[PDB]
Amino acid sequence: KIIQKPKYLVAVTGSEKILICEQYLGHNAMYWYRQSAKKPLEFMFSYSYQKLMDNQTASSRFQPQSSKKNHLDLQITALKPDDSATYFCASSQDRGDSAETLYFGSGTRLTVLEDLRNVTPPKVSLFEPSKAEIANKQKATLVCLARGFFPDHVELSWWVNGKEVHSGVCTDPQAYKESNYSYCLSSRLRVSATFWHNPRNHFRCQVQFHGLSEEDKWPPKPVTQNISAEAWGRAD
Amino acid sequence: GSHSMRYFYTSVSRPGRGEPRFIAVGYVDDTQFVRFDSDAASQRMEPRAPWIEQEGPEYWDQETRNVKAQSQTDRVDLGTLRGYYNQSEDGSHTIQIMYGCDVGPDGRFLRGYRQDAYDGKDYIALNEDLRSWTAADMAAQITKRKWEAAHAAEQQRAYLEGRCVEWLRRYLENGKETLQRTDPPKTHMTHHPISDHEATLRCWALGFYPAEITLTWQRDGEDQTQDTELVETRPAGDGTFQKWAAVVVPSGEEQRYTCHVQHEGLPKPLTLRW
Amino acid sequence: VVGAVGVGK
């Protein structure tokens, strides 16, 4: 039940952000780790009883906030693009030299950009099954494509009859770089030919883009939005 | 021969007088070498023997961090144990902890231990195989279940057979001129008439180290435990110890009694006579 | 050095 806010966060070079981490589990130790491509889980900070026990960050720009009970927020000042990473907060019931296990929060994916104008939500396209697949395999694969978004702050889900499903789904684990200022991501959902031949069934691909909050100013703001494409089954 | 390192912790809740008092003391054999007192001004682990001051600043910062975290651990446990025993917060209670390791003459691990008390009675103790715990009452079994789930015995054993032994060896080497030197007792006898027909003979042993010593009275070469008095060994304050043994004897026959002194620093036992 | 394991009681 570790709470990390927010899950995704865009910031401009030179700005300051707080990464929130709270837990109400009664845990006496809290920690910060950093996930990047080259270092999946790099240790940063260790606190027990709200006191700093150890620190392996080589920049004074990172200052944890431990004066409030249940919290170990992370303040990062004078943000640089090199700071872009997923920041994981962790806690353990017992103090750091005696903990039997660390529980990890969900992470805050931090992306530091030179220019906020490059932030753009995805276009979402739904591609319909092939008649040949339906005729030959008695199955129907729908492919969802999300293109032209930036940064890589997206969650993709499938909704069948208004109920999110995970069976029969495969989404690419990581977005592909379409250009220096654009990503794309793909996914597919496979169902039965009988289930697709039923025109009462409704199929929707949802991409949840995380962009700027309301504090960030903008001269069509790329805000946090659910962008969807949908199709209905056909008898045929 | 053998040597030990041992730490003693005491945490006392004190309604009306602030946060719990936490006192920590470290010993190598009979020599105190560090202390922490939550009431002192420094808020630091402090040296108490010359040879521990051979340690650099990282040592003192890290030990201070570690011992203050232990004081917070005791603070939490004082509250937890109050709930186990259903005690009100307006009362004073005491947690005591002792742990340490012995090495043999070869410097190799011999044994380790850890005992905890609550309000002056056994609470929980590591067993001699360092693999399990003996809890003394119902409340301590709750603690024991938590400590089994957290692999506390394996964590304690890893300290006791590793860091504990390694740092003991380093302390013994840095403190060799005093820790591995035996100071023999300086002895003398006093005579105190208590009446016209009886007098008290007291056998003294002064300035000795380590604290182990044996004082035994004899009459006509035969051991005497009747009408004898043995005092608890006491610190002189300079690192050595003192002790005396007394016997009440018939007046006129004082010279028929002998005091016998045994100490690691004596090539042969000493025999004193008035 | 100190080394009491500090799992809460």
Next chain:
Amino acid sequence: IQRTPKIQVYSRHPAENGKSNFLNCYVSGFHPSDIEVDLLKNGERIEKVEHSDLSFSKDWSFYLLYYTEFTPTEKDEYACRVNHVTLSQPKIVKWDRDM
């Protein structure tokens, strides 16, 4: 659990008049740890008294050493005054250098 303190008052070295020494009051075997220990010179409390760091024995009873630097004389009487929850009234034990 309440255990009465044992009290010994004595000097670090054999007392010699005019020679600096330390007057000690060793209290041991007691529980709980709260205890009042004063050193007295001709009945008056001595200032600047120091004490060792609280420790304890195999039965969990505590022990402490209180000490002050002093110069024995022929005329000056010294004592230890100890109070504890096990004591009705403070316990006063005179220093006997000839013990």
Next chain:
Amino acid sequence: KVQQSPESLIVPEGGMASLNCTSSDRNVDYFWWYRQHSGKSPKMLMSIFSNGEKEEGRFTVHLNKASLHTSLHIRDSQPSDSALYLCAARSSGSWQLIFGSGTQLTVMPDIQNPEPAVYQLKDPRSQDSTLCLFTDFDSQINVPKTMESGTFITDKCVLDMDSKSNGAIAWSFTCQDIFKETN
């Protein structure tokens, strides 16, 4: 520092996954194995606090402390075991876990009757929108990666309806040649 090997491992469904981890810090006493699925947070899998071994279900962890070496054995491997496996160590008297660089484990599903096919799909909301679907191929088959701009080929993606199947997507050339293998 925590050293893990191998960097990546591909095992078939039902196979043994063997993972190793060593520490160069002679002070280490305890080891953890964490598993992190893609897009998820690290979850503790096994922990070991002294010499010996610990079996939990299909997972066995071993610790040889004199060699500062731990190994994780996953028997009867499942496609759902595919994940990043992170080893962590801690020394007595240290105040945090230090993690290694991880092993990426992929468990290939067992495809009994692979019926490889390449289909064309249409987006009805946009003309000239077409992509190719390579589906139902065997798990040991290589999917070509792209080198030209504007053309994208995804890595194989396992979905489960049993009825597990492999798939890859390409869009921008006809469909048969985009999925051809070279070298």
